[PDB]
Ligand binder design. Sequence first.
Ligand SMILES: [Fe+2]
Ligand SMILES: [Fe+2]
Lengths: 192, 192
Amino acid sequence: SFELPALPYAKDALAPHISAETIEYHYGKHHQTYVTNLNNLIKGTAFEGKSLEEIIRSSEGGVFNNAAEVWNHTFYWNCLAPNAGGEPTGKVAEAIAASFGSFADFKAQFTDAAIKNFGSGWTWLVKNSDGKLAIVSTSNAGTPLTTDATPLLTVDVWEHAYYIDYRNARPGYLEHFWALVNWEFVAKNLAA
Amino acid sequence: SFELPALPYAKDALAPHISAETIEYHYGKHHQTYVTNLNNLIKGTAFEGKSLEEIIRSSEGGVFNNAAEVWNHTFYWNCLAPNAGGEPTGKVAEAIAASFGSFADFKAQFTDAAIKNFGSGWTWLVKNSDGKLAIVSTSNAGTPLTTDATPLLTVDVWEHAYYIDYRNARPGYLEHFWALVNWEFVAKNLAA
Ligand SMILES: [Fe+2]
Ligand SMILES: [Fe+2]
């Protein structure tokens, strides 16, 4: 009985970086469908009373794809915000500087990883179990939740995430992604 | 060095099933970029002098992804045509009827497979070396060329192939795909 969590802002709040139309389809159709599909697939199964994270860590096939995508998108919406972007400060800035050399280095590494993540997928900033930050990419519904690394930030590189606004120019999408990064969410994730 | 083969028709030939803008981007940007990236990866290497097929059957990583996608798209453009679609005749009709019972059954199965293919990929009708026909789906740049089967027909289900025209409605795209199938090409593939 999972529900589609409410968007953290107005559907046109990320314009012009991500259009209101993209949110309408991405959130209203894609994300909503993953929720509906997940609910239908777990009915009557041992997954019924489990948390979303629990299902993601104990499933495969269709149940996994839908559950992971539900979580990935909710995390994604929280990674964005209006009147945000720019450079992080405090603990996040310090951790990024220590793990990548500088914010600029991190930004270039994250951008490159995201652009080169072949096909559909996600690119993440995570804190590995060794306490150091790293950038990793996943394919399709893949998520760091199935590992011992903690997700801090992500960018959806499935084409539906940017085709309406940037067509083939995934790099253009990444450029604008930086103008939307919600460092408050990233900071919360790192502080946990 | 590889050249992007000319499209078998003007970019408006498949409209309204596939729009001129989709062709503009799909052929003019996506396909072209695969050619460019392939060229840059193989320049000055032992992959020079090799056919596209030879590269696909002897590579991995980026070389394979780009080489395979170049071939897949050229094959795809030949699978589509104006004033086509409908149902096959002659040898193609016979083979499909013998393997799937009827064209209607084949059509339903191919469509179902294409819709279910998760993430980016392709759905194919192939002929195994023993003469049996089968429907197989691949992920990302995956192609039957790396197997023992012969590609007869394919549909691109990467989101860029249909998002401009159908957004998330991949089923609608598949319906319109059938109005474009170039059975003459399929017959050539089967007769080889
Ligand atoms: Fe998405
Ligand atoms: Fe394509």
